[PDB]
Amino acid sequence: AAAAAANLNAVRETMDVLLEISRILNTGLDMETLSICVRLCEQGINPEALSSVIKELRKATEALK
Amino acid sequence: MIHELLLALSGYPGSIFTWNKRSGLQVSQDFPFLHPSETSVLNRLCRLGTDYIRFTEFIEQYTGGLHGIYLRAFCTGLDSVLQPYRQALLDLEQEFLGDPHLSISHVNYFLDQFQLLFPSVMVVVEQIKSQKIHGCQILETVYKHSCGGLPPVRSALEKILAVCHGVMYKQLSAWMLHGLLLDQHEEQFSLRVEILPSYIPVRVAEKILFVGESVQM
Amino acid sequence: LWEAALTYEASKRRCWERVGCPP
Amino acid sequence: ITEAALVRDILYVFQGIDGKNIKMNNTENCYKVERSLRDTAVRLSELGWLHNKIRRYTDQRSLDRSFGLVGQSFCAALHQELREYYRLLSVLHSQLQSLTLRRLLVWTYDPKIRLKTLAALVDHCQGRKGGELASAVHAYTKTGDPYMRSLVQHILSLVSHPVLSFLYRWIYDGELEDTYHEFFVASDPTVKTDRLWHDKYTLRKSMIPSFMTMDQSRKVLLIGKSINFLHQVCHDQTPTTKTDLENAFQGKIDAAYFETSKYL
Amino acid sequence: PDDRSWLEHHVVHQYWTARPSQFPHSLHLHSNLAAVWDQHLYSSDPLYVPDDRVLVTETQVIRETLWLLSGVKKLFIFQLIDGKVTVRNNIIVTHLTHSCLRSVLEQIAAYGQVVFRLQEFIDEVMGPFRTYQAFMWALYKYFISFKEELAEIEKCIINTTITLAIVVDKLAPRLSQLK
Amino acid sequence: KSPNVLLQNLCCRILGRSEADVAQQFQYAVRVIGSNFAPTVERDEFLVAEKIKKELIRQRREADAALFSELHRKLHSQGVLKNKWSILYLLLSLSEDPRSYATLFAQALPRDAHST
Amino acid sequence: LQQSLELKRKMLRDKQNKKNSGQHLPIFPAWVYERPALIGDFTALPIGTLPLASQESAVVEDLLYVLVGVDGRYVSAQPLAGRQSRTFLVDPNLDLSIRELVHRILPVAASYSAVTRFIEEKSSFEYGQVNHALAAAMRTLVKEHLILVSQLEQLHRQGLLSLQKLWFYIQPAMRTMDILASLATSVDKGECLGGSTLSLLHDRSFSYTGDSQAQELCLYLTKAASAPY
């Protein structure tokens, strides 16, 4: 609809807000990876779990270097 | 509301904040759809826009009274300082487009940088208007106030004064090279105290007079 | 799907008879 | 009656602006209500009272010009600090429509000390100008508080810029041209003929700052005297012949002094 | 119906042709300002004294004023009295409380009078002196290049919002020389 | 959707290599995410807000500490998320300082008295 | 109350005459010591006749305000205002079971008030840079206390707080504040200043070796206090 797309505007607004929040904490995350983990937490998941797996896979560019 | 005030601070007064030559931008109107403390915040805010309007009035009266090439130079830089105050209003309106949940205090906070520049440049304009300074001693009373003590008024008048020198750098180029004196009348012939600033030493003017007069021979 | 819907263009004409967040 | 109205009024008295149901009764007294909430509010209103203290002083000295350039710089410092305090308030304003964090006490706790310290700082610097003003900000850098030393170190960098500007007006020129006495050298109105060396330049002891030793003030007086004496008499001119400030005083001054006296 | 319906929908036709505005409003005070002003009037108990204006949005006025500045004549905005343009007050935008709006349009009309008289003189040589004729051509030469800029700006409206403050500050280096 | 294919997208986001170019991690990751699919400490975004404040003060930037207070109000004003706590705790956890005690910081309750 | 105002002036004259180079010792204004709103601690009906499960909500509601000092609806601050002593009286018509528990929860309020007086009064300069540094880290824990009480204040609104859970919740923060209050009364008692309260923190670090909760606390405070020295 029309009101159903202003919501898509509004989640884009919040995710650019979260994108700045990501950039000033100096995370390795960008908007696209952030776009995956929000979906994961919409399904429900420990952020303790996801931080652990990200801290593992970021060491997998170091296991092949 | 979130553009009404933003035109009140510019060259338009509105009936909300009525204009007066005694003091403009006065709230006297009472609004039951505002908190009663908003009047005080607007009262802080109106003092800056009043100064902006007064600065516009001075350009209106002059671009026999106040006249001269310096008077057609002193007003010109006063435009140039007001330009970031215009851009900084455009940014405010762009902010208010997306998030209208900001209040008057945000506008005041944003235009707090002009509450050090504008009050201390206001008094210079009133001094130059009330007295009949329209020769080359206007550069002195700019230079008397440009030393400052607050850095924002230090950089402002520095610009304004500089263009005046660029005007006098055109008079002193025709004189020393082509031998033309009286390229601009006041406010044999020589430079006197009215057409001489008070920080150029007196010896230099005599040297300049020698240099300019020798061209004709 | 959110990134797929995301690449659309948004209007930058804001109203003056709707100043407070129009679409 | 509700907490939210009290939050709205207390949000205004941060500015020094009376609310709707809390108003100032007497200026020397704190804000008075026009049960637990009523006991709570007074600690927050203390901040606005302290705020009025600083805001009046920087209102008046900023439009004062016999306060000297040093001192108007102090107004600049005070206003610059005050500007950041409004940035919190705007955010708090927009956050309406939880909202009480011990009614935002935890938010306000750190600027409370910064208001207290600045309200002290205006009174220790009361009725002072120049090096008299500089010694007064040097008083609060004997501290052993990290927050206080980090606070004072920036303000001192602000206030001490005109005096160093006058210092380098006296090494590369040697021509004293101040209007307000914020320099430690007092040039005489008489231009002396051969008492130029002995009598024309004298040391003012009040406007000596707290980061310059007595020794240094005396030597740079000698530097200015030498470089002026070279102009008026000898008429040879090499044009522009040449906490603490981390040894830039003792770096520049002795080299300049050495070169100038040699040349003379 | 079938062309009138398309007119009503996909063309504006709502102040310049008398058919009161159905422009969608999403009220709430920044643009509900007329109604809150009426309620405030009622609390001050007028009693009733009803004003009649035709209710336009802002941007149409901007395009009309740019047309006025370009040099064409006979527009719906700015009643003309004896030859001199004068602001009409039967035209309202929701905010700016109808008093600011009068002042801004009066200033633009103050410039429009200066443009109109010159173009009137230029039109009066089209229906042996030969120096007047060389004078009007140079005046015309200014005017055509001057019209070009505003005509460019008006195109960019169709393709972004532009307000009054933009259009007044944009034309500063031209209204300087106009004086 | 399904959580497994989403974690497969995460493994091809961080590592550039394909799902057939890495799967040894991804199966060990499906071990660790399993039965950790729901909060285990306090899920209030209040606490992570006041801890994101303390992490931003640790960078010695005070202008951003009032900026995050506006970013957090934008998150509430649009309201597209149902659990705002988890992604903020995620961004807090992966933080890097650009330049023992636990009593000087805010700790979470272990939820030995409330269901998870 | 009265006794600090003399002490400050006497020690100021002592350190000014002691110095062999220069004047100018700094002072704070009077009001920082005068004001009782710069310290954390400064219907009318019997609660007893009410239903029981409302009394519990009422008492936890007043007690949460009392924890960071500000007075309660059925809680009164008992007037002494001298030493590190501070007691409160809840209403004498209360049921026994709650009343006994309120007694045991009151120590964190007393070890809030005694802590908050110390930092304000010994913000003066006569006890030196090291006392400034020691007070500078003691303020942080007071802020951390305020953090916790804000979170539980949110928790109670959702109908998810009772005195039994709250009793468990305040227990870790009770002991830390107890360590701080013991430190404050010891430092006040010996009139310790300069290096004398740098030896004491050196000792208290060795004192705790089996606990390791408070040992890290003393370690951080001793790290902070040795910095100007």
Numbering used by the authors:
A (entry chain b): 11 to 75
B (entry chain I): 1 to 63, 79 to 202, 256 to 285
C (entry chain L): 282 to 304
D (entry chain H): 245 to 278, 285 to 347, 361 to 505, 524 to 545
E (entry chain J): 210 to 336, 357 to 388, 391 to 410
F (entry chain a): 7 to 105, 113 to 129
G (entry chain G): 150 to 191, 201 to 387
Paper text:
Extensive 3D classification revealed a core of six γ-tubulin-GCP spokes as the minimal stable and most abundant entity in this experiment. This 6-spoke assembly intermediate was resolved to 5.3 Å resolution, sufficient to unambiguously determine the identity and sequential arrangement of spokes based on secondary structure features of the GCP proteins. The cryo-EM density of the 6-spoke intermediate revealed that the first module of the lumenal bridge has already been formed by recruitment of the MZT1-GCP3 module to the GCP3(8) GRIP1 domain. Since only one copy of GCP3 is present in this intermediate, this clearly indicates that the MZT1-GCP3 module of GCP3(8) (rather than any other copy of GCP3) is involved in forming the lumenal bridge. Surprisingly, the outer surface of the GCP3(8) GRIP2 domain is associated with an additional MZT1-containing module. As the only MZT1-GCP3 module present in the 6-spoke intermediate was already stably recruited into the lumenal bridge, MZT1-GCP5 and MZT1-GCP6 were the only other candidates to represent this additional MZT1 module. Notably, GCP3(8) and the adjacent GCP4(9) subunit create a structurally unique binding site for this MZT1-GCP5 module, which likely explains the specific binding of MZT1-GCP5 to the outer surface of GCP3(8), while MZT1-GCP3(8) remains available to form the first module of the lumenal bridge. The overall stabilizing role of the GCP6 GRIP1-NTE is further supported by direct contacts of GCP6 with the GCP5(10) GRIP1-NTE and the GRIP1 domains of GCP4(9), GCP5(10), and GCP4(11), effectively bridging all GCP subunits of the intermediate. Taken together, we conclude that the GCP6 GRIP1-NTE plays a central role in the formation of the stable 6-spoke intermediate, providing a structure-based rationale for the effects of GCP6 truncations on γ-TuRC assembly previously observed in sucrose gradient sedimentation experiments.
The gamma-tubulin ring complex (γ-TuRC) is the principal microtubule nucleation template in vertebrates. Microtubules are formed de novo in a process termed nucleation, which is spatially and temporally highly controlled by γ-tubulin complexes, composed of γ-tubulin1 and associated γ-tubulin-complex proteins (GCP). In most eukaryotes, microtubules are templated from a preassembled γ-tubulin ring complex (γ-TuRC) that determines the position and direction of microtubule growth. Here, we used cryo-EM to identify and characterize γ-TuRC assembly intermediates after recombinant expression of the complex, which allowed us to delineate a comprehensive stepwise assembly pathway from a stable 6-spoked core to the mature 14-spoked γ-TuRC, identifying successive stabilization and conformational locking of γ-TuSC units as central principles in the assembly process.
